[PDB]
Structures are given as structure tokens and as C-alpha cells.
Amino acid sequence: SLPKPILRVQPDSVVSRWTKVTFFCEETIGANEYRLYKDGKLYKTVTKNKKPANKAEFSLSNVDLSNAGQYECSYSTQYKSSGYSDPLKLVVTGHYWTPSLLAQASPVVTSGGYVTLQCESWHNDHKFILTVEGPQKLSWTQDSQYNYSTRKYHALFSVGPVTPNQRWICRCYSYDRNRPYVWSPPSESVELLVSGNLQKPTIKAEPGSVITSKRAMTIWCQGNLDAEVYFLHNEGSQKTQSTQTLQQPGNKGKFFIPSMTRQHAGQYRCYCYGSAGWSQPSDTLELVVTGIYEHYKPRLSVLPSPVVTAGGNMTLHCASDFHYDKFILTKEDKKFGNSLDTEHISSSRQYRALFIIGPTTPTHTGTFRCYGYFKNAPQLWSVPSDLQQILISGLSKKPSLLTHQGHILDPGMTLTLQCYSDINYDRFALHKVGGADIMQHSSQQTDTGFSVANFTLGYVSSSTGGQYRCYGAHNLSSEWSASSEPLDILITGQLPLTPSLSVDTFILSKEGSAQQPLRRCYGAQNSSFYLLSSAS
Ligand SMILES: *[C@@H]1O[C@H](CO)[C@@H](O[C@@H]2O[C@H](CO)[C@@H](O)[C@H](O)[C@H]2NC(C)=O)[C@H](O)[C@H]1NC(C)=O
Ligand SMILES: *[C@@H]1O[C@H](CO)[C@@H](O)[C@H](O)[C@H]1NC(C)=O
């Protein structure tokens, strides 16, 4: 008789509870009156009187559960009421406990593959529906199995085969068979991460891959410039979506973490979807959180000296009273070498690790820290040891020490050491032999025509007396330099004796600072060599 009308809904057929929905009856013949039928019954009637148009609206504001069901549209032209538009199933979510949807292994799927998702729910007699967020809505319906241990009803969906052209976003629903038009509120969006075949995004970690706990860090995913959304993922276990990306320079998907915890460490990969579909995943960037296991801090030492000559063998010692599995050295903020198995020494009650370095390339110069961690948690490290710094000399002119303020000192005289050189080094390093610390200062350009470095030590005590050496380096250079002749600092007033012989060794010095005392007169001993006491 007459052209069957077209019934449309906004928003979609599956609407969340308590939201406004609108039906639209459309035709071209005429518009005398429109009628909306709900489940085979006259629900509403809109007349084109009191503005004249060709399409009629039916608003159902504040939708509740009772508004779910079949809807048809009929119209009348002249005095002919004509048939029905093909029915439209309005579905309302709510009334139930929210189901859970879990990527059974991981959301990761190489294109053309299937992933299994488990959908759980507490409801006794319920069917499960898995839908994907796409144009032509893909659905799957399963019966619920019951896990007697967890006392929960679950069903598994094998969603696939996953095509690399379309973004896959899965959601689950639970619903009673007897009332099909009423589903549960949708579970959390499970988005599948597809390993495409386009170029790989470079993944980066700006502050570093090693981060102390509770601190901030950022993960960048830069790559193809026809990319739209960047993802970060962990083997165990994360999903993160970035839509708003820095366009300058080029698509840079930024991720920000305010404070690092246990659940932020692990191996990260960057997945990416774009106009030409998905891309091959990034390299596995391993994020490491330290500061955890903050009870037993490891301790780091070095032998034979914190400063070794170029081309020598030198061992670092990572030790801890706690039975860690492995110890790892880090230079600056970066990992160094690899992990070594801990080794329980029977004598020192310690767990030991000997990082042997030989020969010493100028690359080993830096600040080392040893961490302890366990096998089952490779990304959760201990609290860093007190730093042990390494200097490596060998290849430049030996920068002599001025050694002013005298050569033999009495507590307490403000001792300062100057380290000069003919070669214009941009930085000098002073070291007291047998010590663990190395001092460094920016050299100042004196008028004469070279650089002098000021090393202001504290008040002279009995402990400040020893042997000193200075080293020189440039700005662009990572190579430190061979040290000068040893400076022997001698301290007085450290023995209850006054010499009258002018006791293994005997010292003799001028009232003025001589270039070197020979071995007023002073008296020392072979064991405690740098300690003296006299009056003449
Ligand atoms: C580097 O250290 C020397 C210390 O020898 C400083 O020299 C002072 O110089 C004044 C005159 O210029 C002398 O009267 C003082 O006796 C010196 N100090 C001492 C402790 O002897 C020099 O100023 C320092 N230079 C820089 C750039 O810090
Ligand atoms: C170990 O280092 C020392 C000095 O650094 C060197 O003389 C010695 O030859 C090294 N050991 C071996 C086996 O070469």
C-alpha cells in the first residue's frame, strides 16, 4: 500500500539507564500523523500541528528499565494508516551487578589472531554478551559456567580473528534470558593491542629507566606520523591510552607517572594504531623501581683504590646481610654491565658479589651504586648503596700540587690544597690515598696563564694527615689524567714526646715551609707515619 517508514534511535539501541533517548520516524510521502508502538502496543502519537515537517520525533527522557523492548513506527497519510517499520530493540543497562572482563593472558595479539577473554559475574542464571566498539557491532553470546571455588559465574569469549585495520575495544554484559532487553551495566573496556606490520615506535624514558620509588617519570612513544593513538603495555601488567599527543616535533605520545611503585615497574612495550592500521610493537623498555626493600641497604666498596691506572684490573664489592638473589652495578642513573648471583661467605656473614673490571677503560670513570634484587621480581630493586666513585688516570701531563700553607701542620690550621698545571684543564680532582672519596672542582683561569684549583679542607685534625694526589681533565674529555708526585701531609702534636736528638723514622723541617722535610726536628714512627709531635 504505502512505503514502509524508517525508525531511527539516538543514541544507539543499547542505552545506559537514566539517560534521554529519542526515536525518529522518517518517510517522504507525507506527515498527517505518526505513531510509535512499543512491543505491539500503541505507545505514543505525534501530530505535525502546532511545526510542519517530514520526520517526527519521540523523546523518552529519563529512561528506566521499563522502557526496554521492541519499537515500531507507523504513519498515516490522508486516511491510510500504513503497516510497520521493521522493529528496533531498545536495550537498557543497569539493574545488575557490573560484570568483570579480563584478558585471559594479555590483550596482546599478533594481527589475524584470537584472544580469549573471561567475563565473570555474581548473578546465578545469566547469559553473557561480548561486544566490540565498531561500526558493524560484533557480538557473542555464551552460557555461564560456575566456578565452585570462587563462587562466581564466568564465560570465555574467543574474540577474533583480529584484523589490523580496525581498533578493537571489547565490553561485556550479563543478562537474564527471561528479560533479554535488560542487560547489566557494561564491564570495563578491554582494548586489544594488535601487533601490526607498520614501522615500530621508539619508546623512551626521559628521567631514565632506573627510578627511585615515589618519584615522577615519563614514557615517550614517538613513531609513525600517521599514528593516532599510542598505547603502553606491560607483560605484567598494564594498558595505557594516549589520544592527545605532542605534534611538535612529530607525533610524540607522552605518558606521565606521578609516583613510581611496585605496580609500575616491569617490561614496557608501545603499541600504536593509525590511519594505515596498527604498527609493530616497540622494543621492550624495562622500567626499574628502586627504593623498595628499604630495610637492608647493600654496601659497595672498591679495591685496590677508587682511582686506578689505565689498563688495570679493579674489583667492586657489593655486599649485604640480606639474602638477595642478585646484585647490579649502576653508573650514574644508568644500569651497568649485568647482574651477578649473590654468594654467601661463611666467614664474614655477608652475601657477596665481586664485579671484576679489567682492563680499565676511561669509560669506568663515574659514580657507581650497587643494588640488590630477587629473581621473581627482576624490576624491583633494593635501596641504593652509599655511592662509590671511580677515577681513571693515565694519559696527560701530571698536574703538580702547590701544597701551600706548609708541609707540616698543627691542629688546627685551615689546610687548603691548590692543584695547578700548564695544560689548561677545565676540572681538577683531588684524592687522599687510602680514602674512599674523590673531590672535584672547576679550575679558575689565573692571570699568569693557566688554571688553578682550590681545595679548601676543614680544620686540620689527626685524621687529615695523609698522602694526596691531583688529576686533570677537560670538558669534552671523559679521559682523566696521570697524577702528580705524592704530597705527604704531616700532623704534629700526636705524640707525648719532645725530641732532643737534633722511633723508627725521624723528621727534620725548616721554620719556613720547606719543599720537603728530610727523613726544628720532629719524631714519628713507622706504623703511624703521618703523625708527629715536637718542639725545638
Ligand atoms: C685559591 O686558594 C688560594 C689559597 O692559597 C687563595 O689565595 C689567597 O690569596 C690571598 C691573596 O691573593 C692570600 O693573602 C691568602 O693567604 C690566600 N689564601 C690562603 C688560604 O693562603 C686564592 O684566593 C684562591 N683562588 C680562588 C679563585 O679561589
Ligand atoms: C691485575 O692488575 C695489576 C695491576 O693493576 C696488573 O699488574 C696485573 O697484571 C693484573 N692481572 C693480570 C692477570 O694481568
mmCIF file of N, CA and C and ligand atoms in Angstrom, residues 309 311-313, ligand 2:
data_model
loop_
_atom_site.group_PDB
_atom_site.id
_atom_site.type_symbol
_atom_site.label_atom_id
_atom_site.label_comp_id
_atom_site.label_asym_id
_atom_site.label_seq_id
_atom_site.Cartn_x
_atom_site.Cartn_y
_atom_site.Cartn_z
ATOM 1 N N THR A 309 95.030 3.078 37.615
ATOM 2 C CA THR A 309 95.715 3.438 36.379
ATOM 3 C C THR A 309 95.014 2.807 35.179
ATOM 4 N N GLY A 311 94.233 0.642 32.103
ATOM 5 C CA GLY A 311 94.673 -0.691 31.754
ATOM 6 C C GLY A 311 94.911 -1.642 32.919
ATOM 7 N N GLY A 312 94.291 -1.401 34.072
ATOM 8 C CA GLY A 312 94.477 -2.293 35.215
ATOM 9 C C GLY A 312 93.217 -3.058 35.623
ATOM 10 N N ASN A 313 93.327 -4.037 36.524
ATOM 11 C CA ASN A 313 92.140 -4.773 36.975
ATOM 12 C C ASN A 313 91.805 -4.302 38.338
HETATM 13 C C1 LIG B 2 95.904 -7.121 37.707
HETATM 14 O O1 LIG B 2 96.171 -5.748 37.804
HETATM 15 C C2 LIG B 2 97.553 -5.478 38.080
HETATM 16 C C3 LIG B 2 97.693 -4.006 38.393
HETATM 17 O O2 LIG B 2 96.527 -3.255 38.079
HETATM 18 C C4 LIG B 2 98.413 -5.945 36.908
HETATM 19 O O3 LIG B 2 99.772 -5.581 37.124
HETATM 20 C C5 LIG B 2 98.218 -7.451 36.740
HETATM 21 O O4 LIG B 2 98.967 -7.973 35.645
HETATM 22 C C6 LIG B 2 96.722 -7.737 36.536
HETATM 23 N N1 LIG B 2 96.474 -9.166 36.431
HETATM 24 C C7 LIG B 2 96.679 -9.894 35.323
HETATM 25 C C8 LIG B 2 96.353 -11.350 35.426
HETATM 26 O O5 LIG B 2 97.116 -9.403 34.297
#
